[PDB]
Amino acid sequence: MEFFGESWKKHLSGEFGKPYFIKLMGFVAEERKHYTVYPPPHQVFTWTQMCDIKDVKVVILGQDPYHGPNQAHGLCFSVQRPVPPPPSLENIYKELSTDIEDFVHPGHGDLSGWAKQGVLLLNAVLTVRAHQANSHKERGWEQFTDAVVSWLNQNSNGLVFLLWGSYAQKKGSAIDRKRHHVLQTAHPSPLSVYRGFFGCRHFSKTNELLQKSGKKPIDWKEL
DNA sequence: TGTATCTT
DNA sequence: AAAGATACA
Structure with a gap:
């Protein structure tokens, strides 16, 4: 048992030996020696530990990890108990309540x-x-x-990609826009949320798309 | 003080 | 590149 989930490691390990990845891991190591870096090393790849890669139906893509102490744990926008939801997550919760x-x-x-x-x-x-x-x-x-x-x-087929913020949206070009469903809105941070996130209705729209394709919807209450 | 995006 | 201007606690 390690940092990568097995199915994710199997399909991403071809990246490990590439020069950019070696330079990336070297850079992070050097940063950790001179600064505090989030999340902890063992939690960088938490996003690979939650389901098998073939069972992914929806992708929420954000900018980068929370940069405050004890916040980031390898899942975008998430904080482990007893840490209070940061402003971004409270905004996500506000949209979910109306949506x-x-x-x-x-x-x-x-x-x-x-x-x-x-x-x-x-x-x-x-x-x-x-x-x-x-x-x-x-x-x-x-x-x-x-x-x-x-x-x-x-x-995969019929995935729902939710691209939140300019930096996440850079990945839009790599997605087949007919085969999969790309929804794009502002980052839920208070600095940007007012630019479309509030009222984006991404959560209900996601389930509409999934149910249409005959897939089980996400229970957004199931936390 | 603290939580993106556009523009240059 | 990187910095200045630009809802609510």
Whole structure:
């Protein structure tokens, strides 16, 4: 048992020996020596530990991990108990309350419940320097997360990609827009949420698409 | 003070 | 590249 889930490792391990990945891992190691980097090393790949890769139905793609202490744990927007949901997650919960009739605030911020249902909770960049949003961009993570999206694009059908923010949306070009369903809106951070996230109705729309394709919907209350 | 996006 | 301007606690 290790950092990568077995099915994810099987289909992404071809990246490990590539120069960009070696330089990426080297960069993160050096950063960890001189700064506080989030999430902890053992939690960078938590997004591979929640379901088999073939059972992914929905992809939520954000920018990068939470950059405050004890927040980021390898699932986009998620915080483990007893950590309070950050402003971004409270905004996600606010949208869910208007979008999903039966949804009420769960009283915690752990999104493992969604991930287990086949919702990939990915960020475009997978580490961050404390207190500095997007500080680890353009270092190799983009190419790696491109490999994640590209594998899913090729080996699946009728996926729902939810691309939240400019940086997540860079991956839109790698997705077959007829074969899969790309929904795009502003990042749920208070700095950007007012630019379309509120009222985007991504959660109900996702389930509409899934049910149309004959797939089981996500129970957004199941956390 | 703290939580993106556009523009240059 | 990287920095300045731009809802609500």
